[PDB]
Amino acid sequence: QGVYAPAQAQIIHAGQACVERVYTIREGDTLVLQCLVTGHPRPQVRWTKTATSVLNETLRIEKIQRLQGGRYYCKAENGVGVPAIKSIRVDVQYLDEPVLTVHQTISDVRGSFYQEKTVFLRCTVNSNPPARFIWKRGAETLNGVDIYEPLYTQGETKVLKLKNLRPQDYASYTCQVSVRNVCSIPDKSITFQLTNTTAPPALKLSVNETLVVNPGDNVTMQCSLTGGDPQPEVLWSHSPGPLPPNSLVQGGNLTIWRIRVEDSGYYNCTAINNVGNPAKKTVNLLVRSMKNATFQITPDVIKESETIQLGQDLKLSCHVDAVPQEKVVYSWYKNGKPARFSDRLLITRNDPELPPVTCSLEIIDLRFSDYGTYLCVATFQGAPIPDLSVEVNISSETVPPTISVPKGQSTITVREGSRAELQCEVRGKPKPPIIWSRVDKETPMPSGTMTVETYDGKLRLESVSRDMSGTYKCQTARYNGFNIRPREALVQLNVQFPPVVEPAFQDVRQGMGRSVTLRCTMLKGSPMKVATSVWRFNGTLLAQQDYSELKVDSVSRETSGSYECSISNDVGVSACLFQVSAKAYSPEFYYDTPNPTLSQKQSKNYSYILQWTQKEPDAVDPILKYRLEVRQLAQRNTIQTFIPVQKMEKGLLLEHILPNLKVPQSYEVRLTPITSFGAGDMAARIIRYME
Ligand SMILES: *[C@@H]1O[C@H](CO)[C@@H](O[C@@H]2O[C@H](CO)[C@@H](O[C@@H]3O[C@H](CO)[C@@H](O)[C@H](O)[C@@H]3O)[C@H](O)[C@H]2NC(C)=O)[C@H](O)[C@H]1NC(C)=O
Ligand SMILES: *[C@@H]1O[C@H](CO)[C@@H](O)[C@H](O)[C@H]1NC(C)=O
Ligand SMILES: *[C@@H]1O[C@H](CO)[C@@H](O)[C@H](O)[C@H]1NC(C)=O
Ligand SMILES: *[C@@H]1O[C@H](CO)[C@@H](O)[C@H](O)[C@H]1NC(C)=O
Ligand SMILES: *[C@@H]1O[C@H](CO)[C@@H](O)[C@H](O)[C@H]1NC(C)=O
Ligand SMILES: *[C@@H]1O[C@H](CO)[C@@H](O)[C@H](O)[C@H]1NC(C)=O
Ligand SMILES: *[C@@H]1O[C@H](CO)[C@@H](O)[C@H](O)[C@H]1NC(C)=O
Ligand SMILES: *[C@@H]1O[C@H](CO)[C@@H](O)[C@H](O)[C@H]1NC(C)=O
Ligand SMILES: *[C@@H]1O[C@H](CO)[C@@H](O)[C@H](O)[C@H]1NC(C)=O
């Protein structure tokens, strides 16, 4: 490629800037960067910040922000050689209003019981560039007292330390912070009234550390100041989440109406006045609830049993999830209630190694007299909430569980996106719930956690993703049944999905007598086999290995057009699209030359050196002639002429002088190649008098 030259970029600065390698502007202004490029063919330009991208030789950002600052890249490519890249660092600049805060420090003195008070005046401001701080008490401070930047701060903060605090120091101190007026940014000031009444905030709360309540109850909390100068600002907050709904803040008073169980949590009242540590009082609000009452049958452990056998230990545990967990109390009944007071032979244990906070009675030397219906009742002492119970019949019939997959739903295949339903079925007395997990990987579930409880033994997946395709485990719970090694069973999940073929579009060129073959290849797809391929031409079907091929015997006017191969797996369809013709490629205008020729500076005429190259001359039938059209933008009528080609090769520069052009005006130039097939791809350009 003799005349083809690789791209070359150069960034240029415009829009608003201020004051080498960097483009500094005030936040809120507008950025305007332009990428000038050269090389042939004329390269295209995208602005990016990664090296996302905007396809434009000029980058323009209105009302720029702090974060939009950074390094920007102009990328320019044309096919020939290595793409051109150029960088520029945009440094958006700003100066917010400074914050002024103060705290005291009392400290001992060597060999003395006298004490020295020290105040720290801390001035913080976020700014680009690094700010400049000046301190004043009406007058500028230099010396006796000290200025510095404290630790754990990168110059955004300066502190004025007043070591021994004598009355004359009690004045108004004012931090004035400047950005050097760079980018014409004003300085800003903040002042503080340091007085012997100045004091950090303090609060008193009308309720205890932790407050227990029932659902529905209205609860109101008064948070009142007990100290603070300046007058601090009191604020309530909640974790997790925000306060509302159903809760109103008078200010200081926080009331919660019709409290729901999910409203439980920490409510924090905090006072701030930029003096000392902000005061906070914290109350933990606990709404009562009881959920998920569960029992466990644990056969003799020491005899390593998994089954109810006479002459063995049988533990029957009991548990429920409650907010004031420590406050629950359990009652064990049996065909009516003995309240588990027997002890001898049958005994109560409330806290063994078993799960947390579980009442569990043991039966030593199990007897037929122990076969019965046992009930455990969890309750809160004199609480309005309802009690919860768990019945568990023990008899000869009670037996550990077994789990299986029904029929051959072991592997269940579905198409991506649809819903999937995995099923396990469990047998035993009692029948425990099933816990579904994934085994091929460690991912979560419908419930968003590693495992999911289910009693119907069904696991439903609404929007199934191919990523989810894998193996899944279903197993017996250790609760609401035997507490034994869970029984397990696996099911496979195939997530089929439609094909993806290549190329989506391809522009194919070839001479008039010659042949061409189009291939549509399948890259991804489950099933990964071409079930069928169907080729169409300009809308109509044609008659006809991982891919499909079609051969156009003779690329002619009758055969040239758009070909579509619709490849499909048993699940979906996807298509390649080919454009076949014997049209020559577009001419590529050459932009980098001094062009105009003044004809005797008279007749109001100049001439233009129109130059270009022919893209891929040997891709189709040889180029015979170019059709040249010239319009001057001002007259509708156009002068059409034909250039006859002498000879050409890839990259050869072509020329044609346009003879009669009004001396000031510009023109549109349309250049079309002609082969035996006819008109190739037309190209266009605007020419102008330069000098
Ligand atoms: C209802 O209550 C029962 C227990 O009373 C809950 O079963 C418990 O579920 C948790 C997981 O949520 C299990 O803890 C986990 O154990 C694995 C190891 O097995 C560990 O890797 C995890 O970090 C986590 O600690 C716990 O073992 C299990 N307890 C029993 C006795 O099986 C059940 O989840 C509750 N259901 C609901 C809907 O609240
Ligand atoms: C570049 O962006 C401007 C708007 O900022 C737009 O007017 C112009 O047409 C764009 N350039 C191109 C080549 O589209
Ligand atoms: C503080 O200063 C004021 C006058 O500025 C004075 O009335 C007061 O006694 C001083 N001492 C205290 C503890 O406020
Ligand atoms: C809380 O107040 C509302 C009316 O403001 C009332 O309907 C509700 O019953 C109150 N809460 C209780 C526990 O009574
Ligand atoms: C908060 O409520 C109490 C009475 O419940 C009242 O004395 C106090 O003024 C209230 N505070 C506000 C800011 O309304
Ligand atoms: C409220 O205080 C608790 C206890 O100190 C704390 O865990 C929680 O993060 C705090 N929440 C807020 C919003 O301050
Ligand atoms: C226990 O057995 C009784 C009668 O034998 C029955 O009414 C009750 O429903 C059974 N309980 C369970 C949990 O099966
Ligand atoms: C197919 O359609 C394209 C676009 O309309 C057209 O250029 C071509 O001549 C058509 N081919 C035939 C054989 O009609
Ligand atoms: C100047 O241009 C006009 C219009 O294009 C043409 O008629 C005329 O012959 C030209 N004169 C010369 C001296 O080239």
Residue numbers in the entry: 19 to 37, 45 to 76, 86 to 176, 182 to 583, 589 to 735
Article sentences:
Members of the presynaptic neurexin (NRX) and postsynaptic neuroligin (NL) transmembrane protein families form the axis of a signaling pathway that is crucial for the formation and function of excitatory and inhibitory synapses throughout the brain. MDGA proteins bind NLs and control their function and interaction with NRXs via unknown mechanisms. MDGA proteins are attached to the postsynaptic membrane via a C-terminal GPI anchor, and their large (∼900 amino acids) extracellular domain consists of six immunoglobulin-like domains (Ig1-6), a fibronectin type III-like (FnIII7) domain, and a memprin, A5, mu (MAM8) domain. The extracellular region of the NLs contains a cholinesterase-like domain that forms a stable interaction with the α/β-NRX1-3 LNS6 (laminin, NRX, sex-hormone-binding globulin) domain (Araç et al., 2007, Chen et al., 2008, Fabrichny et al., 2007).
Following an extensive screen of constructs from various species, we obtained diffraction-quality crystals and solved the structure of the complete chicken MDGA1 extracellular region (cMDGA1ECTO; Ig1-Mam8; Gln19-Lys919; 79.5% sequence identity and 88.4% sequence similarity with human MDGA1ECTO) using selenomethionine single-wavelength anomalous diffraction (Se-SAD) at 3.20 Å. cMDGA1ECTO was treated with endoglycosidase F1 (Endo F1) prior to crystallization, leaving a single N-linked N-acetylglucosamine monosaccharide on glycosylated Asn residues after enzymatic cleavage. Seven domains (Ig1-6 to FnIII7) could be unequivocally resolved in the electron density maps; however, the C-terminal MAM8 domain was not visible and most likely highly mobile and accommodated in the solvent channels of the crystal. The cMDGA1ECTO Ig1-6-FnIII7 domains form a surprisingly compact, folded structure that is ∼120 Å wide, ∼110 Å high, and ∼50 Å deep, fitting comfortably within the typical height of the synaptic cleft (∼20–25 nm). Finally, the Ig1-FnIII7 domain contacts (395 Å2 BSA) close the cMDGA1ECTO triangle and are formed between (1) the Ig1 N-terminal stretch (Gln19-Tyr22) and loop BC and (2) FnIII7 loops AA′ and C′E, and β strands βA and βB. The linear orientation of Ig1 and Ig2 is stabilized by a disulfide bond, distinct from the core Ig domain disulfide bonds, between Cys36 located on Ig1 loop AA′ and Cys222 located on Ig2 loop FG. In the crystal, two MDGA molecules form an unexpected intertwined dimeric arrangement with individual C-terminal ends pointing in opposite directions. Homophilic interfaces are formed between domain pairs Ig1-Ig5∗, Ig2-Ig2∗, and Ig6-FnIII7∗ (where ∗ denotes contributions from the second MDGA monomer); their combined BSA is 2,666 Å2, suggesting a stable association. The scattering data were unambiguously incompatible with a dimeric MDGA1 molecule but were instead accurately (χ2 = 1.17) modeled as a limited ensemble of monomeric conformers with pronounced flexibility at the FnIII7-Mam8 domain linkage.
